């Protein structure tokens, strides 16, 4: 009675800063084939393979809009943006990016919020008003990005007897217009923390709309724009100095998350209790893993051969994606 975790992958286009320096296309982009050739023998399974010239509406209609229909089930649905440092996770969902000419430069977030105001227009039956939150996961500490300052001793999480997670110390603002939504995304992305200048912390944007089941059994539905971090592993040659200390603490949280998600599909040697409690980005995604709640995996890789094994490590992120 449980639907499996849907598995998708994205290839980014190649920038001239890696093209002219000789980074050959180690990947084999095969979007319609449902698979991707790496090297000469690595052939992996993916439901939706995204080419390096794909459209954000096609990304929106392959995974997100089928969960937007499933958001009206009154149940959870979660899609993140995974990749290594420099994979384009900013472009993947479409926040902290303001061009808005062709409108394909911004991605899923104005499409799902603009379409969310489109769905307020039709379904005028259920009493519904959406409030969202926009938080930071930084050095295993939280920060209300919608506020210029809030105590870390105040911003803590909760857990009930039903089995959910409640936030505290979080500025919650309802929606009235996509101008207000992009105003909160603008002020929040300005309040986040070079060009990206760290691309470091997790920026978590949770959309919340309870669906009043029909003065009765309340049916809660949440949808999740959880933007992940860069997944540099090897890099002795990258993050140095004090900025070494910025990279190193979240780097343990990365394989903490990978240690969590790989404890489900492999029961071969006493597959023990799932340690969601180890990291603060994992307890917020305990609801985002398994069960009647929905989760679809989308990751962004690089065509550069220098991150080749790292791309395979991203594929190792994707190989153990079962459920």
């Amino acid at each position: 009675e449980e639907a499996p975790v849907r598995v998708a992958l994205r290839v980014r286009p190649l920038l001239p800063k890696e093209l002219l320096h000789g980074h050959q296309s180690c990947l084999q982009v095969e979007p319609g084939l449902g698979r991707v050739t790496l090297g000469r023998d690595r052939h992996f399974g993916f439901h939706v393979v995204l080419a390096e010239d794909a459209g954000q509406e096609a990304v929106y209609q392959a995974c997100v809009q089928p969960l937007l229909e499933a958001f009206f089930e009154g149940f959870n649905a979660t899609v993140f943006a995974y990749g290594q440092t420099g994979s384009g996770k900013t472009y993947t969902m479409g926040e902290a990016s303001v061009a808005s000419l062709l409108e394909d430069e911004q991605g899923i977030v104005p499409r799902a919020m603009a379409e969310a105001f489109k769905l307020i227009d039709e379904n005028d039956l259920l009493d519904c008003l959406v409030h969202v939150s926009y938080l930071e996961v930084y050095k295993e500490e939280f920060r209300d990005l919608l506020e210029v300052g809030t105590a870390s001793r105040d911003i803590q999480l909760r857990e009930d007897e039903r089995g959910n997670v409640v936030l505290c110390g979080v500025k919650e603002v309802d929606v009235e217009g996509l101008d207000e939504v992009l105003s909160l995304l603008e002020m929040g992305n300005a309040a986040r923390h070079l060009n990206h200048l760290s691309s470091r912390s997790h920026t978590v944007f949770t959309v919340t709309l309870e669906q009043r089941g029909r003065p009765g059994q309340l049916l809660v539905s949440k949808f999740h724009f959880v933007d992940l971090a860069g997944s540099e592993r090897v890099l002795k040659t990258g993050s140095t100095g004090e900025r070494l200390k910025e990279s190193i603490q979240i780097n343990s949280s990365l394989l903490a998350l990978g240690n969590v998600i790989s404890a489900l599909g492999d029961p071969q040697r006493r597959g023990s209790h799932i340690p969601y409690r180890d990291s603060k980005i994992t307890r917020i995604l305990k609801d985002s893993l398994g069960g009647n709640a929905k989760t679809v995996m989308i990751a962004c890789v690089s065509p550069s051969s220098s991150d080749f094994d790292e791309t395979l490590n991203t594929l190792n992120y994707a190989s153990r994606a079962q459920n």
Partner: protein, 426 residues
């Protein structure tokens, strides 16, 4: 290497007062005077627990905190109540609320900053900071609410050094006042995320060791805290004397945890003999060996044999040979190998001192991590959800701003802590 000291709670003063009996005797220190130890090797790394700001004197780098003054007022009247710089005292004449949250949200909360000024004056007072010793109790709010309030602010302040948690878990039947167990739950809900080492102790274990193995029939509490002073005098500055293979706090931290859940530790001390009756002509490291691993001589509530052994480190104190150490550790790897879980081959961690204590020829220091502590917190769970169901002591905590939703989160977090202990008891 430098470490500051913390005594919170009405219990805690004594919790470590006896320690400040011991270690000053370990270096040859008067109540007022100086380094009168005859051996120069009692001096060479005293900076881990000490400073010299009046110069000729000695000062324990220590911060003594209570929410009711008369306890530490009795301490400063004690025999070692003059060796403190009394400006290091931080307290108040507030009502020391027996609520956890009243020491965690209101009373000490307007005394936190007064503590933090002394931890910052004392932290960068001298050379590079090494670790923190948290001596308190869970038996009430005073060591627990202000305790994890302190160190929960401290890890936000200092994300770097080591947090040693001397907790006092209540004994599973010999209670104190039956309002008790909530002062475990909300405390330990905010222990595991804000420490990396927790040496938990248990009361009826103290009566078990003091009352039976030592044949003294009258367990004075100063003798109990004297035994805990033998523990922490066993652990750290023992390694900060010369040692053949001498570890630190950080090595023990990386050793005895599988995971960052850190799986709170259970200490023991080997030579436990009655006073004059135990002429024995068989006292050496070896004895410490079989003495360490029995069901008694354990400061834990549950029987340690009842689960596996994940990691056990030992700190042997005496002029001795590692062949007749590591051979004995091989014996423990053999004769008890069923409950000595297989998939880590070295559950042992050898630690070698060079010095005895003041009178004994040879001692030893047990630090343990079984899986058996599963049936401690489950015990603490089983009482917790028992008289949570009546909701009958709910008003004292609601009246201090603590809300409803916190409790069930604490139940789930300590709950699946117990569940993963079961998942690795195997």
């Amino acid at each position: 290497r430098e470490i500051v000291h913390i005594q919170a709670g009405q219990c805690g003063n004594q919790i470590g007062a006896k320690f400040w009996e011991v270690i000053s005797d370990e270096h040859g220190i008067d109540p007022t005077g100086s380094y009168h130890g005859d051996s120069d090797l009692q001096l060479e790394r005293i900076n881990v627990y000490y400073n010299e700001a009046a110069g000729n004197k000695y000062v324990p780098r220590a911060i003594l905190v209570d929410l009711e003054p008369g306890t530490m007022d009795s301490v400063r009247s004690g025999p070692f109540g003059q060796i403190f710089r009394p400006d290091n005292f931080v307290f108040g004449q507030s009502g020391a609320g027996n609520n956890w949250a009243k020491g965690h949200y209101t009373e000490g909360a307007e005394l936190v900053d007064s503590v933090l000024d002394v931890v910052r004056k004392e932290s960068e007072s001298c050379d590079c900071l090494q670790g923190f010793q948290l001596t308190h109790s869970l038996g009430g709010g005073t060591g627990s609410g202000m305790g994890t309030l302190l160190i929960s602010k401290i890890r936000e302040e200092y994300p770097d050094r080591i947090m040693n948690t001397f907790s006092v878990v209540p004994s599973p039947k010999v209670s104190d006042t039956v309002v008790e167990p909530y002062n475990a739950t909300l405390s330990v809900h905010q222990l595991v995320e804000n420490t990396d080492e927790t040496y938990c102790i248990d009361n009826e274990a103290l009566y078990d060791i003091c009352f039976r193995t030592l044949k003294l029939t009258t367990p004075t509490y100063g003798d109990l805290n004297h035994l805990v002073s033998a523990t922490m005098s066993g652990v750290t500055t023992c390694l900060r004397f010369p040692g053949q293979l001498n570890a630190d706090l950080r090595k023990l931290a990386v050793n005895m945890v599988p995971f960052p859940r850190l799986h709170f530790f259970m200490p023991g001390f080997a030579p436990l003999t009655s006073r004059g009756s135990q002429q024995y002509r068989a006292l050496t490291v070896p004895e410490l060996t079989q003495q360490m691993f029995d069901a008694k001589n354990m400061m834990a509530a549950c029987d340690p044999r009842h689960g596996r052994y994940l990691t056990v480190a030992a700190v042997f104190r005496g002029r001795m040979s590692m062949k007749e150490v590591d051979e004995q550790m091989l014996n423990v790897q053999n004769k008890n190998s069923s409950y000595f879980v297989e998939w880590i081959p070295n559950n042992v961690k050898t630690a070698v001192c060079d010095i005895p204590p003041r009178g004994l020829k040879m001692s030893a220091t047990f630090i343990g991590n079984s899986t058996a502590i599963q049936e401690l917190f489950k015990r603490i769970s089983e009482q917790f959800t028992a008289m949570f169901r009546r909701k009958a002591f709910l008003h004292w905590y609601t009246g201090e701003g603590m809300d409803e939703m916190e409790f069930t989160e604490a139940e789930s977090n300590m709950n699946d802590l117990v569940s993963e202990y079961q998942q690795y008891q195997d």
